[PDB]
Amino acid sequence: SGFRKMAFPSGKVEGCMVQVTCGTTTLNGLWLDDTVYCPRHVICTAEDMLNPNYEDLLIRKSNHSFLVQAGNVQLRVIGHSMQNCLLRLKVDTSNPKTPKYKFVRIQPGQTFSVLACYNGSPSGVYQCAMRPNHTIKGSFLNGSCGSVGFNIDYDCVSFCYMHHMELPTGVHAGTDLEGKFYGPFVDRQTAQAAGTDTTITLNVLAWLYAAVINGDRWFLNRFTTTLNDFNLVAMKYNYEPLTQDHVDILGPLSAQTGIAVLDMCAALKELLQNGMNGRTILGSTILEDEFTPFDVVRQCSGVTFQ
Amino acid sequence: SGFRKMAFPSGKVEGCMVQVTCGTTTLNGLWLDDTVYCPRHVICTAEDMLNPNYEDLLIRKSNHSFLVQAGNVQLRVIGHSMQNCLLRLKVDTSNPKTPKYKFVRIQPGQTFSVLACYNGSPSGVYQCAMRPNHTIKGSFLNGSCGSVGFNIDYDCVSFCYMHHMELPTGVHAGTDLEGKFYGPFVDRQTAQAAGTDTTITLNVLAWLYAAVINGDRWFLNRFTTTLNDFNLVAMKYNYEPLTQDHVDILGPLSAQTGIAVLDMCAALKELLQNGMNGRTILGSTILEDEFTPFDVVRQCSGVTFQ
Ligand SMILES: Cc1cc(S(=O)(=O)c2c([N+](=O)[O-])cc(C(F)(F)F)cc2[N+](=O)[O-])c(Cl)cc1Cl
Ligand SMILES: Cc1cc(S(=O)(=O)c2c([N+](=O)[O-])cc(C(F)(F)F)cc2[N+](=O)[O-])c(Cl)cc1Cl
């Protein structure tokens, strides 16, 4: 029993973190096989960040412009290229600790683990959801950029995030491991801001199913609702519209608990209109939206506490 | 910016997790040098758990009664002893992945990282506080016992918890790595229950300092208080009494933010009596008590957002 925001064990990623230095700028890189990945912003100087032309800044560099440090060992760069907002540095040593991996572009609403790192040294690990507005509420200080986000699937690490910037509201933005930003953000100093966000409806419903699996039914009711009537309430409370696809995804959780998805939606509607009346759900006084259906099935028992 | 419950990177502990089998019972063990540590409950049968005599159950075992599996490799037990509520199995191979480590007995209020494990395979990692009533609000299913709790100090892993049981309220209990239980619990099936708990005052104050370091001052006020007047309010709201030692510990955070500890206590008192009036603190609608002063200094910037 219990229910916590659980991260994936981080060892397989820890063995991939390196330090990349260009000029006066140091940040983190990801070393897989004979390639190091890092934010291309490493090549900017303290006067370059307003309107840096990365094509122009990079042509002016050589392989030995880049210092890559793996622990106390210095790796030699024998090649370099730009891929979107990342640099790819070829090095003369293949990472012996390379795990099985893939690069994936995650969808909004989906969760992953972040290994926060400074100067190539892992510092902490925590779970994050990709917000609908394509930012994450991370925890990051200066020098964290190049820290990565991942999920682990058996022995395979699916890398999905590399950190690049903090936005004015203190939330965070970055790219996939192909260097394409999540969201409309750019790696230069502008007036960019997070767009308005919304609550991840599918994840709140997932979490209500987790609460029932863990033995709590207090918030249920005798009503049902149609998708459309639910969605009228949803927009009132700044929730994502629920779709038939989302209803289908909740099938397994619905089967395990014997509660119809649209009946759970009726419960949510009531929670939204009436509040929680001093009560908690899985320890929480608020409706949580950073657990996916997948996250609930991973962590919760396969047999419910009836 | 941001503020999250951050766990320590778990790789150094992942390389220490093994599977221990005796009879029909399988659970997790911790392999350091040539010793495997695990809960002594591994030697009970399905009819032994009411009043097992572990001295009696163990004398009846040999070294080959125990099957220890490290990944796909079988370790051979060449010795065994009981230390309080743990077994210590000597094996014929020293763990090549042994990190620098120590065993520590943590105090209530203190936090650590849990590496949740099943059948010797790490599954997830999350941060926990040792409650004043000596339980933890973990997330654990059948087969998690022998999962460990730890803190990491440079390259040194300080092991402080090994998991043994779930109590009737769904909270968790275990021992230090000398096999001594935290709390009055015993490793047998009885009517034992968690005693009443209280909020960790020192940690709530720490977290209020974190909120100010991160730029938020809304909850402050123009008042101060004495220790004694604060403590009158504290017992009303089921908070730990604040002591001069706790005031002294908050010194560094007090200096960084320019807010006197007893002035922050006046703020807490007001929060306790008046509520949060629809507002949040570091994203939270409630007062959080699972971050220590140490945790705040580890994660927060050393320069406050004035
Ligand atoms: C990719 C990257 C960006 C920055 S940044 O200078 O700090 C930065 C950037 N940025 O990416 O160039 C954009 C923005 C904004 F415009 F999006 F707000 C804000 C910041 N910032 O936190 O000062 C730093 Cl230091 C390091 C890296 Cl690796
Ligand atoms: C050390 C240990 C205990 C149990 S236990 O059978 O599950 C157990 C124990 N226990 O430790 O013997 C005590 C209590 C209680 F009395 F404290 F409530 C409750 C349980 N339980 O969750 O069924 C299991 Cl399976 C595995 C281990 Cl390694």
Side-chain angles (χ1 to χ4, degrees):
Chain A
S1 181
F3 203 77
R4 297 218 75 122
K5 255 152 200 169
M6 272 205 320
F8 284 101
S10 63
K12 281 167 176 71
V13 176
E14 289 168 55
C16 296
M17 301 309 297
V18 301
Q19 193 174 24
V20 186
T21 307
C22 193
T24 174
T25 301
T26 291
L27 41 105
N28 305 286
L30 222 222
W31 180 26
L32 303 161
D33 297 317
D34 59 359
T35 298
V36 172
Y37 302 80
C38 73
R40 67 183 182 170
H41 200 271
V42 68
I43 65 179
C44 302
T45 42
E47 58 282 339
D48 265 307
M49 302 137 355
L50 221 51
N51 249 119
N53 186 287
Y54 287 97
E55 300 74 13
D56 202 69
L57 291 164
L58 189 54
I59 196 75
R60 303 177 190 261
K61 311 289 182 176
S62 66
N63 286 336
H64 56 274
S65 296
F66 300 98
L67 177 55
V68 173
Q69 317 177 232
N72 205 173
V73 177
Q74 202 209 306
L75 305 178
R76 179 151 146 277
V77 175
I78 64 185
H80 62 272
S81 68
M82 185 159 68
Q83 181 186 15
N84 298 297
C85 298
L86 302 196
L87 300 185
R88 305 214 267 194
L89 315 179
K90 193 197 239 204
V91 290
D92 63 359
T93 305
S94 194
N95 187 357
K97 293 184 187 174
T98 305
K100 186 191 166 187
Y101 73 94
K102 38 195 198 52
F103 295 160
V104 301
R105 184 174 177 83
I106 221 76
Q107 298 290 298
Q110 301 190 309
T111 56
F112 53 98
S113 301
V114 167
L115 180 66
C117 289
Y118 301 89
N119 304 124
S121 303
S123 165
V125 59
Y126 55 84
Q127 195 76 347
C128 266
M130 175 61 73
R131 305 299 315 169
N133 75 356
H134 315 278
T135 63
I136 65 172
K137 297 182 191 187
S139 182
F140 288 119
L141 298 178
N142 297 139
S144 57
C145 293
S147 296
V148 301
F150 59 103
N151 284 287
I152 308 180
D153 355 89
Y154 326 116
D155 64 313
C156 185
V157 182
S158 288
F159 292 100
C160 59
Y161 180 86
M162 181 169 271
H163 180 60
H164 289 243
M165 336 146 330
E166 183 165 296
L167 290 166
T169 44
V171 303
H172 301 104
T175 67
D176 64 24
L177 268 292
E178 289 186 331
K180 303 177 156 162
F181 264 86
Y182 292 104
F185 310 109
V186 293
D187 52 351
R188 79 223 330 97
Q189 218 140 277
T190 79
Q192 51 190 337
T196 55
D197 201 26
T198 76
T199 296
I200 308 155
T201 303
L202 176 57
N203 289 3
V204 179
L205 290 166
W207 177 77
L208 294 178
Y209 279 108
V212 168
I213 290 166
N214 274 211
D216 199 349
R217 291 175 66 102
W218 72 262
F219 44 82
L220 303 182
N221 67 32
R222 71 176 203 270
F223 306 109
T224 190
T225 186
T226 61
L227 251 202
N228 215 261
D229 283 339
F230 173 82
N231 282 338
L232 288 175
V233 171
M235 277 356 287
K236 152 86 202 254
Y237 290 92
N238 192 29
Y239 271 52
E240 226 118 276
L242 191 68
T243 66
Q244 186 55 54
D245 286 359
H246 296 158
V247 174
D248 291 350
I249 282 171
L250 287 173
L253 284 175
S254 186
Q256 187 180 325
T257 57
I259 303 162
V261 172
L262 286 174
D263 294 349
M264 190 68 86
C265 286
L268 218 195
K269 170 195 284 181
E270 186 173 304
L271 288 179
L272 284 180
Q273 292 165 338
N274 293 1
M276 283 170 56
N277 270 308
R279 309 200 56 166
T280 62
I281 300 179
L282 289 165
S284 184
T285 59
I286 54 145
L287 303 167
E288 300 267 345
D289 82 343
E290 294 208 358
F291 295 96
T292 69
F294 180 89
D295 293 347
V296 170
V297 163
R298 152 156 103 109
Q299 176 169 185
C300 281
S301 173
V303 326
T304 127
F305 190 18
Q306 305 188 38
Chain B
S1 181
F3 203 77
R4 297 218 75 122
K5 255 152 200 169
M6 272 205 320
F8 284 101
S10 63
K12 281 167 176 71
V13 176
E14 289 168 55
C16 296
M17 301 309 297
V18 301
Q19 193 174 24
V20 186
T21 307
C22 193
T24 174
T25 301
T26 291
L27 41 105
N28 305 286
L30 222 222
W31 180 26
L32 303 161
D33 297 317
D34 59 359
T35 298
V36 172
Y37 302 80
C38 73
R40 67 183 182 170
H41 200 271
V42 68
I43 65 179
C44 302
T45 42
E47 58 282 339
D48 265 307
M49 302 137 355
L50 221 51
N51 249 119
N53 186 287
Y54 287 97
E55 300 74 13
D56 202 69
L57 291 164
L58 189 54
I59 196 75
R60 303 177 190 261
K61 311 289 182 176
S62 66
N63 286 336
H64 56 274
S65 296
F66 300 98
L67 177 55
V68 173
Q69 317 177 232
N72 205 173
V73 177
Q74 202 209 306
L75 305 178
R76 179 151 146 277
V77 175
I78 64 185
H80 62 272
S81 68
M82 185 159 68
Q83 181 186 15
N84 298 297
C85 298
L86 302 196
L87 300 185
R88 305 214 267 194
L89 315 179
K90 193 197 239 204
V91 290
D92 63 359
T93 305
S94 194
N95 187 357
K97 293 184 187 174
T98 305
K100 186 191 166 187
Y101 73 94
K102 38 195 198 52
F103 295 160
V104 301
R105 184 174 177 83
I106 221 76
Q107 298 290 298
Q110 301 190 309
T111 56
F112 53 98
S113 301
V114 167
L115 180 66
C117 289
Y118 301 89
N119 304 124
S121 303
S123 165
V125 59
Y126 55 84
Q127 195 76 347
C128 266
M130 175 61 73
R131 305 299 315 169
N133 75 356
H134 315 278
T135 63
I136 65 172
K137 297 182 191 187
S139 182
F140 288 119
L141 298 178
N142 297 139
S144 57
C145 293
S147 296
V148 301
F150 59 103
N151 284 287
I152 308 180
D153 355 89
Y154 326 116
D155 64 313
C156 185
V157 182
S158 288
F159 292 100
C160 59
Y161 180 86
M162 181 169 271
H163 180 60
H164 289 243
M165 336 146 330
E166 183 165 296
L167 290 166
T169 44
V171 303
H172 301 104
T175 67
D176 64 24
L177 268 292
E178 289 186 331
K180 303 177 156 162
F181 264 86
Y182 292 104
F185 310 109
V186 293
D187 52 351
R188 79 223 330 97
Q189 218 140 277
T190 79
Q192 51 190 337
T196 55
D197 201 26
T198 76
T199 296
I200 308 155
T201 303
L202 176 57
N203 289 3
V204 179
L205 290 166
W207 177 77
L208 294 178
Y209 279 108
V212 168
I213 290 166
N214 274 211
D216 199 349
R217 291 175 66 102
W218 72 262
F219 44 82
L220 303 182
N221 67 32
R222 71 176 203 270
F223 306 109
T224 190
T225 186
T226 61
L227 251 202
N228 215 261
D229 283 339
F230 173 82
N231 282 338
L232 288 175
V233 171
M235 277 356 287
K236 152 86 202 254
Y237 290 92
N238 192 29
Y239 271 52
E240 226 118 276
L242 191 68
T243 66
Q244 186 55 54
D245 286 359
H246 296 158
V247 174
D248 291 350
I249 282 171
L250 287 173
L253 284 175
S254 186
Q256 187 180 325
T257 57
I259 303 162
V261 172
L262 286 174
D263 294 349
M264 190 68 86
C265 286
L268 218 195
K269 170 195 284 181
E270 186 173 304
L271 288 179
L272 284 180
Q273 292 165 338
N274 293 1
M276 283 170 56
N277 270 308
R279 309 200 56 166
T280 62
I281 300 179
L282 289 165
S284 184
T285 59
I286 54 145
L287 303 167
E288 300 267 345
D289 82 343
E290 294 208 358
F291 295 96
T292 69
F294 180 89
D295 293 347
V296 170
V297 163
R298 152 156 103 109
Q299 176 169 185
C300 281
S301 173
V303 326
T304 127
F305 190 18
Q306 305 188 38

